[PDB]
Design an enzyme around this catalytic site. Structure first.
Site, short mmCIF file in Angstrom:
data_model
loop_
_atom_site.label_atom_id
_atom_site.label_comp_id
_atom_site.label_asym_id
_atom_site.label_seq_id
_atom_site.Cartn_x
_atom_site.Cartn_y
_atom_site.Cartn_z
CG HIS B 41 -0.65 0.14 2.47
ND1 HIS B 41 -0.28 1.36 3.00
CD2 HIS B 41 -0.56 -0.75 3.48
CE1 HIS B 41 0.05 1.21 4.27
NE2 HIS B 41 -0.11 -0.07 4.59
N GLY B 143 2.55 6.42 9.53
CA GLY B 143 3.93 6.35 9.11
C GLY B 143 4.70 5.16 9.64
CB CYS B 145 2.74 1.10 7.22
SG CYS B 145 1.05 1.31 7.81
#
Lengths: 305, 305
Positions: B41, B143, B145
């Site tokens: 993503h 942030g 991830c």
């Protein structure tokens, strides 16, 4: 979202850990520039610890009696000296992995990360706090002495603790990196009882703010209090008295959440008087006091190093 | 003595963290040999996450659209591919800090350390467990991830988790390093509710053994039970059923303490039915389930890396 007891990343400190052996005793040392710091009781046998005369014991030691090993490679000791309860071993090679660093002496209530080590090898990292009675509640087995506690601000490691002793009650005592013990403790195997382990009120309040920021808000109530009224309750429950300085430190969290500091004090007062009734806050069934206000702000904003 | 929720030393993983930016989205990547792994993503905008077609979105991306930065230095992307829910970005330079590593897919109940990172920079490290409903209870802000979870066995880092998603309920979901989500979760901003968060029984028992080893023994009682009788109580309290395999895994702790596994089960049964009556065990007012039997043995013996 989510709030965890979080330690600082330990890599900068891992690169400084060495093994120190003197005679039959092995513990950990901290290698920064061309100096290795370790507990002075590395010179002691088990017998010695009952009543050690460190200056006399040190007279029988020479540079070559201090065996310092960094991983698989031996360091050459070119001088040694005792400073309070630490030894400083001068080596002929500066640690190439030395980070930016400072030595700081922390106050009770402040938190720090511990890198537990054995034989100079890191085993784990965890967060703890200097208790108001100047002990810490760590996880230290035989051989962990010389493991260090630290905080990181961006690129700079502030070393604040070196482990020396376990008290007969299972709590831990140690020094700053200048070798001065926190609290009244001494590096002798004797009767040293800790004082009252009081709760760090400003940290509990910070953690309640963290809980609100993360959605745990059942404990918020319709009440307020004053500093003096709250402190009557704090005394009853062995909490540290809350000062105006503490109120000011909580200012940023109060501003972010819109909950006045004294309103949160009234929530804490109700939690102290009534308990948690089988409910939890941030996964805990008791009031957690090992997050400082700065820890809460840091973890809730994502500060990196 | 002392027992703490302890993470693995994070240095070996810190050396692998990079920043990945694609268009307007920035998250973390894991740089091992000449491959950077990150959540797919990264190619998505906020709009895209409501109903993303990843194959279609990826068609509009080229190697030069993936900006990979390791500290202050840029890495050159020479290929990219999608594997399940991760992207593999081939770079022209092998990470010189690549540790020995494996990719493992863990089972529910197993624990691991998380290095929380933002913009490729480590922020903190903490221990957590894969819950029986295949979520984890982490601390992840926007942030984070691509932050990873791992275990260390001596010199080898076993990576088991990459962070992808926060559910609307505030718990966390992610993948193994092959890009397969744990549990039923998907990398889309939709209604995904977690199942029952059951308690990891074998871990609670391990932690009770840790408590006895460290002197907390008030909860030991005069009773025993059987597997089937204990499991009637486990079901009532949303605990995982205890199996003979679990009993066998607890064998070493039973041998060390002299407390038969089924006797500890009877202590746990009484704790479930009667509560802790305002008492604590290892500093906790609830029954802790995020230490595995192997974690307890490791911390109680001082295993290093």
């Amino acid at each position: 979202s989510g709030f965890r007891k979080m330690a600082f990343p330990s890599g900068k400190v891992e690169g400084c850990m060495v093994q120190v052996t003197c005679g039959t005793t092995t513990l950990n040392g901290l290698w920064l520039d061309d100096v290795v710091y370790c507990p002075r009781h590395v010179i002691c046998t088990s017998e010695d610890m009952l009543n050690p005369n460190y200056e006399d014991l040190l007279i029988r030691k020479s540079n070559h009696n201090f065996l310092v090993q960094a991983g698989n490679v031996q360091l050459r000791v070119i001088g040694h000296s005792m400073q309070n309860c630490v030894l400083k071993l001068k080596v002929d090679t500066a640690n190439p992995k030395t980070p930016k660093y400072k030595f700081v002496r922390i106050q009770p209530g402040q938190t720090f990360s511990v890198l537990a080590c054995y034989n100079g090898s890191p085993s784990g990292v965890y967060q703890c706090a200097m208790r108001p009675n100047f002990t810490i509640k760590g996880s230290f087995l035989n051989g962990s002495c010389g493991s260090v506690g630290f905080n990181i601000d961006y690129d700079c490691v502030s070393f604040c603790y070196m482990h020396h002793m376990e008290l007969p009650t299972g709590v831990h005592a140690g020094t700053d990196l200048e070798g001065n013990f926190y609290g009244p403790f001494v590096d002798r195997q004797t009767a040293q009882a800790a004082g009252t382990d009081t709760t760090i009120t400003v940290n509990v309040l910070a953690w309640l703010y963290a809980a609100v920021i993360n959605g745990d808000r059942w404990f918020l109530n319709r009440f307020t209090t004053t500093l003096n009224d709250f402190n009557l309750v704090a005394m009853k429950y062995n909490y540290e008295p809350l000062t105006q300085d503490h109120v000011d430190i909580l200012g940023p969290l109060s501003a972010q959440t819109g909950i006045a500091v004294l309103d949160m004090c009234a929530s804490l007062k109700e939690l102290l008087q009534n308990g948690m009734n089988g409910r939890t806050i941030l996964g805990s069934a008791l009031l957690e006091d090992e997050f400082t206000p700065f820890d809460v702000v840091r973890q809730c904003s994502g500060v990196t190093f």
